[PDB]
Design an enzyme around this catalytic site. Structure first.
Site, mmCIF file in Angstrom:
data_model
loop_
_atom_site.group_PDB
_atom_site.id
_atom_site.type_symbol
_atom_site.label_atom_id
_atom_site.label_comp_id
_atom_site.label_asym_id
_atom_site.label_seq_id
_atom_site.Cartn_x
_atom_site.Cartn_y
_atom_site.Cartn_z
ATOM 1 N N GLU A 149 -1.786 7.598 -14.577
ATOM 2 C CA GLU A 149 -1.276 7.106 -13.298
ATOM 3 C C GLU A 149 0.238 7.268 -13.196
ATOM 4 O OE1 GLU A 149 -2.913 6.517 -10.745
ATOM 5 O OE2 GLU A 149 -4.904 5.806 -11.369
ATOM 6 N N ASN A 161 0.481 8.146 -0.338
ATOM 7 C CA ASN A 161 -0.871 8.638 -0.078
ATOM 8 C C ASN A 161 -0.986 9.207 1.319
ATOM 9 O OD1 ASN A 161 -1.718 5.669 -1.697
ATOM 10 N ND2 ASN A 161 -1.948 7.689 -2.624
ATOM 11 N N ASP A 163 -2.928 8.507 3.676
ATOM 12 C CA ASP A 163 -3.158 7.484 4.695
ATOM 13 C C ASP A 163 -1.902 6.679 5.039
ATOM 14 O OD1 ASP A 163 -2.929 5.775 2.515
ATOM 15 O OD2 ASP A 163 -4.729 4.620 2.971
ATOM 16 N N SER A 192 -0.272 4.692 2.905
ATOM 17 C CA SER A 192 -0.062 3.689 1.868
ATOM 18 C C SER A 192 0.718 4.322 0.713
ATOM 19 C CB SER A 192 -1.396 3.121 1.367
ATOM 20 O OG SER A 192 -2.151 4.100 0.674
ATOM 21 N N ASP A 234 1.373 3.975 -3.747
ATOM 22 C CA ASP A 234 0.987 3.442 -5.056
ATOM 23 C C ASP A 234 2.234 3.123 -5.867
ATOM 24 O OD1 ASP A 234 -1.719 4.194 -4.393
ATOM 25 O OD2 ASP A 234 -1.113 6.235 -4.963
ATOM 26 N N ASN A 285 -2.090 0.135 -5.141
ATOM 27 C CA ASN A 285 -1.973 0.657 -3.785
ATOM 28 C C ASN A 285 -1.730 -0.400 -2.696
ATOM 29 O OD1 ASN A 285 -3.721 1.525 -1.179
ATOM 30 N ND2 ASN A 285 -2.634 3.254 -2.048
ATOM 31 N N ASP A 344 -12.923 -6.631 -8.742
ATOM 32 C CA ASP A 344 -13.291 -6.519 -7.322
ATOM 33 C C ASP A 344 -14.681 -5.934 -7.074
ATOM 34 O OD1 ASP A 344 -12.210 -6.783 -4.458
ATOM 35 O OD2 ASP A 344 -12.741 -4.653 -4.491
#
Ligand SMILES: [Cl-]
Ligand SMILES: [Cl-]
Ligand SMILES: [Cl-]
Length: 129
Positions: free
Chosen positions: A35, A46, A48, A50, A52, A59, A101
């Site tokens: 990562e 990203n 979209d 967003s 990280d 994110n 989650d």
């Protein structure tokens, strides 16, 4: 801060990540390697919109607030900047929520693609832990 491999393993263990939700320390170190290359200051934008953040590339669509991700949530209740600190506490605490989650470490696409099913113990081999 760019952590050493064993240094990060030790910090993660200190913060209770070792075997958290059944994921051995090598899984977490492997995820961080791919990562962020162990760099707490890593950021990536990203498609979209967003972003990280940090050693585990957490994110802003779901987990932290950066003020620039429309329609997003802040489920870890932290500014995304907290995920960039030399102190990994905020990243670890948030990662604990993420991995709980529902999909385990599959939440980290890079863990799924590069760590899952591999000899992850290699990431902590030799480390005084
Ligand atoms: Cl391991
Ligand atoms: Cl936002
Ligand atoms: Cl990937």
């Amino acid at each position: 801060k760019v952590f050493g491999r064993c240094e990060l393993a030790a910090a993660m263990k200190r913060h209770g990540l070792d075997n958290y939700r059944g994921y051995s320390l090598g899984n977490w170190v492997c995820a961080a390697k791919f990562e962020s290359n162990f760099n707490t200051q890593a950021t990536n934008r990203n498609t979209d919109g967003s972003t990280d953040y940090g050693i585990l590339q957490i994110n802003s669509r779901w987990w932290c607030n950066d003020g620039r991700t429309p329609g997003s949530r802040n489920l870890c209740n932290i500014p995304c900047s907290a995920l960039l600190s030399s102190d990994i506490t905020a990243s670890v605490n948030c990662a604990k929520k993420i991995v709980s989650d529902g999909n385990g470490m599959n939440a980290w696409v890079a863990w799924r693609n590069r760590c899952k099913g591999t000899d992850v113990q290699a990431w902590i081999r030799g480390c005084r832990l």
